Amino acid sequence: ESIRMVLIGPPGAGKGTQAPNLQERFHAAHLATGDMLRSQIAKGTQLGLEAKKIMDQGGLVSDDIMVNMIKDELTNNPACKNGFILDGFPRTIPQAEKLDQMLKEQGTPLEKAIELKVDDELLVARITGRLIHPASGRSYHKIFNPPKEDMKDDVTGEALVQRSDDNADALKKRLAAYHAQTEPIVDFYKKTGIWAGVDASQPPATVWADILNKLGKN
């Protein structure tokens, strides 16, 4: 009834689609560094405006900023006492090493790192057709996962938007950055013994059953 885990995958693999499932099943805090940055943007803060430029170019925000953000949420957020799902963090080796140290000092080490494996060619179609409900994070897909009431949140009525970093230009840079900087983290968790791989090219419900299976709960 408690999990401390990391969700790793390329842009469009299905992290934001699966994290609700995990958060419902294990009652864990969902810590998504992308959503945290996007809330800074919506508040119009200075960190938000600087991060927006970097995100829209397909680059990565500084390790120092990202490590500080997570450290404060782990320390000051009460829901993180029940367990947590890290989504989009760590994203570089330095972030992974600093997380390892943090958790060692708190005495709450990671149990699992789930890699969502899916080929790049599929990811373009997923990113191109995405619509998000900006007031929650709810992602839909024009073809693959439609709003029943078009361009509207099926369960909350409000309009869906396109993310500003979801275009072919930014996406090419986001994929290259994933392969260069993030994918090395997978070997880090293989060596520590907590890695499990999942076929993320399957449909959502199939991927969710695969994840439950890989976690050792079901």
Ligand X SMILES: Nc1ncnc2c1ncn2[C@@H]1O[C@H](COP(=O)(O)OP(=O)(O)OP(=O)(O)OP(=O)(O)OP(=O)(O)OC[C@H]2O[C@@H](n3cnc4c(N)ncnc43)[C@H](O)[C@@H]2O)[C@@H](O)[C@H]1O
The edge-to-edge listing of strands for the beta sheet with 29-32 is 29-32, 84-87, 4-8, 112-117, 195-199
Residue ranges at the known binding site for ATP: 12-17, 130, 139-140, 202
User: Whole-angstrom Cα distance, residue 113 to residue 197?
Assistant: 9
Active-site position among 4, 91, 112, 126: 91
Q: Tell me if residue 91 is catalytic.
A: yes
- Is 204 a binding residue for ligand X by CB under 6 A? The answer is yes
In angstroms and rounded to an integer, the radius of gyration of the C-alpha atoms of the chain is: 17
39, 134 Cβ separation under 8 angstroms: no
User: Whole-angstrom Cα distance, residue 28 to residue 38?
Assistant: 21
Which parts of 125-184 interact with ligand X (CB under 6 A)?
A: 126, 129-130, 139-141, 144-145, 174
* Nearest distance from C-beta of residue 29 to ligand X, angstroms: 16
* # residues contacting ligand X (CB under 6 A): 33
Which parts of 44-103 interact with ligand X (CB under 6 A)?
A: 54-55, 59-61, 66, 88-89, 91, 95
3-state secondary structure of 200: coil
Q: Tell me if residue 130 is catalytic.
A: yes
Active-site position among 142, 152, 163, 190: 163
Burial 116-150 (b: 16+ CB within 10 A, else e): bebeeeebeebbbbbbbbbeeebbbbeeeeebeee
Site residues (CB under 6 A) for ligand X?
9, 11-17, 33-34, 37, 54-55, 59-61, 66, 88-89, 91, 95, 126, 129-130, 139-141, 144-145, 174, 203-204, 207
Q: Which residues are catalytic?
A: 15, 91, 130, 163, 174
